[PDB]
Each structure stands twice: as structure tokens, then as C-alpha cells.
Short mmCIF file of C-alpha atoms in Angstrom, two decimals:
data_model
loop_
_atom_site.label_atom_id
_atom_site.label_comp_id
_atom_site.label_asym_id
_atom_site.label_seq_id
_atom_site.Cartn_x
_atom_site.Cartn_y
_atom_site.Cartn_z
CA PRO R 347 -150.16 -134.34 -23.95
CA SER R 348 -153.25 -136.32 -22.97
CA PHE R 349 -152.55 -138.54 -19.96
CA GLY R 350 -154.58 -141.23 -21.70
CA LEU R 351 -152.20 -141.78 -24.61
CA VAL R 352 -149.14 -141.47 -22.37
CA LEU R 353 -150.58 -143.90 -19.83
CA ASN R 354 -151.51 -146.29 -22.63
CA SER R 355 -148.37 -145.74 -24.71
CA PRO R 356 -145.86 -148.58 -25.22
CA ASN R 357 -143.39 -146.63 -23.08
CA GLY R 358 -145.79 -145.17 -20.54
CA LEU R 359 -145.73 -146.37 -16.93
CA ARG R 360 -147.40 -149.78 -17.11
CA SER R 361 -144.77 -150.67 -19.71
CA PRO R 362 -141.71 -152.81 -18.89
CA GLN R 363 -139.33 -150.16 -20.22
CA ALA R 364 -140.67 -147.68 -17.67
CA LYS R 365 -140.14 -150.08 -14.76
CA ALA R 366 -136.45 -150.38 -15.64
CA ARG R 367 -135.98 -146.61 -15.83
CA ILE R 368 -137.68 -146.18 -12.46
CA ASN R 369 -135.40 -148.77 -10.87
CA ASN R 370 -132.44 -146.43 -11.36
CA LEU R 371 -134.45 -143.57 -9.85
CA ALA R 372 -135.35 -145.64 -6.79
CA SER R 373 -131.64 -145.56 -5.95
CA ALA R 374 -130.85 -142.03 -7.12
CA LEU R 375 -133.86 -140.40 -5.45
CA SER R 376 -133.17 -142.27 -2.21
CA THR R 377 -129.59 -140.99 -2.27
CA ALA R 378 -130.69 -137.48 -3.26
CA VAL R 379 -133.30 -137.13 -0.52
CA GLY R 380 -132.32 -137.53 3.12
CA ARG R 381 -130.95 -135.03 5.63
CA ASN R 382 -130.33 -132.36 2.99
CA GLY R 383 -133.92 -132.36 1.80
CA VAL R 384 -133.14 -133.42 -1.76
CA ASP R 385 -130.24 -133.49 -4.22
CA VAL R 386 -131.20 -131.80 -7.49
CA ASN R 387 -128.03 -133.17 -9.07
CA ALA R 388 -129.11 -136.75 -8.43
CA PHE R 389 -132.81 -136.01 -8.91
CA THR R 390 -132.43 -134.22 -12.25
CA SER R 391 -129.79 -136.77 -13.25
CA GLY R 392 -132.47 -139.44 -13.35
CA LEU R 393 -134.96 -137.42 -15.38
CA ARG R 394 -132.28 -136.71 -17.98
CA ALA R 395 -131.84 -140.45 -18.52
CA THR R 396 -135.58 -141.16 -18.61
CA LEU R 397 -136.39 -138.25 -20.92
CA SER R 398 -133.69 -139.35 -23.36
CA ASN R 399 -134.96 -142.93 -23.33
CA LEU R 400 -138.61 -141.90 -23.67
CA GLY R 401 -137.75 -139.40 -26.39
CA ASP R 402 -136.65 -142.38 -28.47
CA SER R 403 -138.88 -145.08 -26.98
CA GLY R 404 -141.66 -144.50 -29.49
CA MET R 405 -143.51 -141.52 -28.04
CA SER R 406 -143.28 -137.77 -28.66
CA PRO R 407 -140.75 -135.27 -27.25
CA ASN R 408 -143.63 -133.59 -25.43
CA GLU R 409 -145.10 -136.69 -23.79
CA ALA R 410 -141.72 -137.81 -22.45
CA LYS R 411 -141.53 -134.53 -20.52
CA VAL R 412 -144.74 -135.33 -18.64
CA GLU R 413 -144.18 -139.09 -18.57
CA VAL R 414 -140.84 -138.70 -16.79
CA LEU R 415 -142.58 -136.84 -13.97
CA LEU R 416 -144.60 -139.98 -13.24
CA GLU R 417 -141.57 -142.25 -13.59
CA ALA R 418 -139.86 -140.29 -10.81
CA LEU R 419 -142.87 -140.76 -8.54
CA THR R 420 -142.89 -144.54 -8.94
CA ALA R 421 -139.30 -144.67 -7.69
CA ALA R 422 -140.25 -142.73 -4.57
CA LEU R 423 -143.62 -144.38 -3.97
CA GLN R 424 -142.06 -147.84 -4.19
CA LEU R 425 -139.35 -146.73 -1.77
CA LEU R 426 -141.88 -145.44 0.77
CA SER R 427 -143.18 -149.01 1.07
CA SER R 428 -139.78 -149.86 2.55
CA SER R 429 -139.29 -146.54 4.33
CA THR R 430 -140.49 -145.31 7.73
CA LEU R 431 -142.60 -142.28 6.83
CA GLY R 432 -142.72 -141.37 10.51
CA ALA R 433 -142.44 -137.61 10.08
CA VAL R 434 -143.43 -134.78 7.74
CA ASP R 435 -140.89 -131.97 7.42
CA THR R 436 -143.46 -129.38 6.33
CA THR R 437 -140.83 -126.77 7.17
CA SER R 438 -138.68 -127.96 4.27
CA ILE R 439 -141.57 -127.92 1.80
CA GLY R 440 -140.18 -124.80 0.15
CA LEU R 441 -136.86 -126.58 -0.31
CA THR R 442 -138.39 -129.76 -1.75
CA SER R 443 -140.84 -127.98 -4.03
CA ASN R 444 -138.03 -125.66 -5.13
CA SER R 445 -135.68 -128.56 -5.85
CA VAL R 446 -138.14 -130.43 -8.07
CA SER R 447 -138.85 -127.21 -9.97
CA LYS R 448 -135.17 -126.61 -10.72
CA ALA R 449 -134.52 -130.31 -11.34
CA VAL R 450 -137.43 -130.71 -13.76
CA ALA R 451 -136.50 -127.49 -15.56
CA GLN R 452 -132.84 -128.51 -15.42
CA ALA R 453 -133.23 -131.95 -17.01
CA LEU R 454 -136.44 -131.38 -18.97
CA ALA R 455 -137.22 -127.66 -19.09
CA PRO C 290 -147.10 -126.94 -21.02
CA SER C 291 -143.49 -125.82 -20.66
CA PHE C 292 -142.01 -126.37 -17.20
CA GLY C 293 -140.83 -122.77 -17.29
CA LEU C 294 -144.19 -120.99 -17.30
CA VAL C 295 -145.86 -123.50 -14.99
CA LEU C 296 -142.99 -123.18 -12.52
CA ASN C 297 -143.14 -119.40 -12.84
CA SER C 298 -146.92 -119.24 -12.51
CA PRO C 299 -148.57 -117.94 -9.32
CA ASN C 300 -149.80 -121.48 -8.66
CA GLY C 301 -146.69 -123.38 -9.71
CA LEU C 302 -144.54 -125.12 -7.11
CA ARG C 303 -142.64 -122.26 -5.47
CA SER C 304 -146.04 -120.74 -4.73
CA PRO C 305 -147.52 -120.76 -1.19
CA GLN C 306 -150.72 -122.43 -2.39
CA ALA C 307 -148.72 -125.33 -3.83
CA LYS C 308 -146.89 -125.92 -0.54
CA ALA C 309 -150.18 -126.18 1.35
CA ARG C 310 -151.64 -128.67 -1.13
CA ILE C 311 -148.54 -130.87 -0.95
CA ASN C 312 -148.78 -130.90 2.84
CA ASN C 313 -152.10 -132.75 2.64
CA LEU C 314 -150.60 -135.23 0.18
CA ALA C 315 -147.57 -135.79 2.40
CA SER C 316 -149.99 -137.39 4.86
CA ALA C 317 -152.35 -139.08 2.40
CA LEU C 318 -149.59 -140.55 0.23
CA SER C 319 -147.71 -141.78 3.30
CA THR C 320 -150.86 -143.57 4.48
CA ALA C 321 -151.51 -144.95 1.00
CA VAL C 322 -148.00 -146.34 0.54
CA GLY C 323 -146.63 -148.81 3.07
CA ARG C 324 -146.97 -152.58 3.33
CA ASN C 325 -149.70 -152.77 0.68
CA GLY C 326 -147.56 -151.08 -1.96
CA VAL C 327 -149.82 -148.07 -2.47
CA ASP C 328 -153.45 -147.02 -2.03
CA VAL C 329 -154.82 -145.59 -5.28
CA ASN C 330 -157.87 -144.37 -3.35
CA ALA C 331 -155.74 -142.15 -1.11
CA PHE C 332 -153.17 -141.43 -3.82
CA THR C 333 -155.69 -140.30 -6.43
CA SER C 334 -157.72 -138.59 -3.70
CA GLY C 335 -154.92 -136.09 -3.19
CA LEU C 336 -154.45 -135.43 -6.90
CA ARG C 337 -158.16 -134.77 -7.39
CA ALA C 338 -157.96 -131.96 -4.83
CA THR C 339 -154.79 -130.53 -6.37
CA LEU C 340 -156.01 -130.67 -9.97
CA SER C 341 -159.26 -128.95 -8.99
CA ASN C 342 -157.45 -126.28 -6.97
CA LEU C 343 -154.92 -125.63 -9.74
CA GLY C 344 -157.61 -125.76 -12.40
CA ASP C 345 -159.05 -122.64 -10.79
CA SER C 346 -155.90 -121.16 -9.26
CA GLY C 347 -155.23 -118.99 -12.29
CA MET C 348 -153.54 -121.40 -14.69
CA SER C 349 -154.82 -123.50 -17.60
CA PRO C 350 -156.65 -126.85 -17.46
CA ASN C 351 -153.63 -128.40 -19.18
CA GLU C 352 -150.91 -126.98 -16.93
CA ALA C 353 -152.63 -128.22 -13.77
CA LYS C 354 -152.47 -131.76 -15.17
CA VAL C 355 -148.67 -131.55 -15.41
CA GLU C 356 -148.19 -129.29 -12.39
CA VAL C 357 -149.93 -131.79 -10.12
CA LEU C 358 -147.31 -134.39 -11.05
CA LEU C 359 -144.65 -132.23 -9.39
CA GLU C 360 -146.86 -131.43 -6.40
CA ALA C 361 -147.31 -135.16 -5.77
CA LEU C 362 -143.55 -135.74 -5.87
CA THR C 363 -142.81 -132.92 -3.43
CA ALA C 364 -145.05 -134.60 -0.87
CA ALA C 365 -143.07 -137.83 -1.17
CA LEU C 366 -139.61 -136.29 -1.51
CA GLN C 367 -140.17 -134.11 1.55
CA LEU C 368 -141.44 -137.15 3.45
CA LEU C 369 -138.41 -139.25 2.50
CA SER C 370 -136.25 -136.76 4.41
CA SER C 371 -138.05 -138.01 7.52
CA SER C 372 -138.33 -141.62 6.37
CA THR C 373 -135.83 -144.49 6.43
CA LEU C 374 -135.51 -145.37 2.74
CA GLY C 375 -133.70 -148.58 3.64
CA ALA C 376 -134.66 -150.55 0.54
CA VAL C 377 -136.08 -150.39 -2.99
CA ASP C 378 -138.25 -153.45 -3.63
CA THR C 379 -137.85 -153.53 -7.41
CA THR C 380 -140.28 -156.45 -7.39
CA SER C 381 -143.16 -154.14 -6.47
CA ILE C 382 -142.31 -151.77 -9.33
CA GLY C 383 -145.09 -153.28 -11.42
CA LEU C 384 -147.57 -152.40 -8.69
CA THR C 385 -146.21 -148.90 -8.09
CA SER C 386 -146.02 -148.02 -11.78
CA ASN C 387 -149.51 -149.47 -12.22
CA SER C 388 -150.92 -147.56 -9.26
CA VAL C 389 -149.53 -144.21 -10.40
CA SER C 390 -150.97 -144.74 -13.87
CA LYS C 391 -154.44 -145.61 -12.57
CA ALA C 392 -154.30 -142.95 -9.86
CA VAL C 393 -153.04 -140.22 -12.19
CA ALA C 394 -155.68 -141.07 -14.80
CA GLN C 395 -158.26 -141.50 -12.04
CA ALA C 396 -157.83 -137.95 -10.74
CA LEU C 397 -156.39 -136.20 -13.80
CA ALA C 398 -157.53 -138.24 -16.79
#
């Protein structure tokens, strides 16, 4: 799935439909990540909604899998702008990286 | 690029090499995102290093493109645990979604 077609698609990231899907993630991701590292239930819950929407937005069932990954980042990146980012729990990296892996393979797979 | 093989690969997310790469992004991304929305220069700068590392870590040139997406999220998710996440700013969505698209295609595409 070329990132060029997905980034230029009518349902990519620069699209209005993607912004709406991310909005929901901005709240879910924020509630999923905190003192517990990250909530796969809430994290994967968002991807499931985005994947389903993208799968019928006009793109392919393969592009939506990779497109969703970016949609989840926008929700976090936008949140960081209003966050504190005054610490890096590098000790929980294994937990975070492990959560995303299970979440992505749990909602998308 | 199924999320099963990439996540099971020696250079996936649960791998030690992936955790180290994310660490660098956890600092770059944090510095890129703040009051200016997001710095594509710093954002894409981290992906370029990850894509290159993964492109020669033992996987395929197509898996690294999708694997990086998860590596970039882990850096943010892990950071959120130490952030404040006291907002959402859905008005900056257009900028965030636009930055990720340009950054992703700038380093990957």
C-alpha cells in the first residue's frame, strides 16, 4: 500500500473524514494512556472504528490498515500540543510498544 | 504487510532494537509538538532514521514503511504517560493530520 495513494486518497489524512475519526481517538487515546501506560481496550477500540470507516470510505481493505495507524498518531500528536511532555518513561517502552502491537493486531490484524 | 509477521519479526515492536529507536523519537517528537502544533522537520527526522534502520534490520522495504508507523506512536503514547493531556484542540486537527501526512511521506514516501 503505497503511502502516496493513501496520503492522497479521498479518505487519507488530509481529508475531512480523517479529521473526524481522529477526534474520537484524541479522547480515547488520552483516556487509554496515563498512569497505566496505555489501555489497549480503548486504543484498539478506536482503530476498529477507523478501519471500518476507511474500509468503506472509498479506499482498499489493505490501505485502511496502514491509514488507521496514521490516524491514531494525529490524535496523540494533537494532544501533545496541549500536554506537558515533561518526562520520558523509557522504562515502560516495552509496555507501550507491546500494547500498540496487540491493539493493532487486535483491531486490524 | 500483515501486522502479524511484522509484529513477530526480529525488528518489529517487541524487539529491543525497536525500543531504542522509539526512545530517540520520544524526545524528537516531544520537541516537535508543542505550541506550534508539530515540527515536520523533527517529526520526519525520526522516521527517516527508523525507516532506514528497519529497512536493513532484516525485514522488507515494505514492512518497515508500516512498522515505522507503530514505532512513532509508541514514542508518543509512552510520553503521554508522563504528560498532562489536559485538552484536545480539535481545531488544530487539520495541522496535525497535515503534518503527519507530509512527515510520513517525507521520510517514508
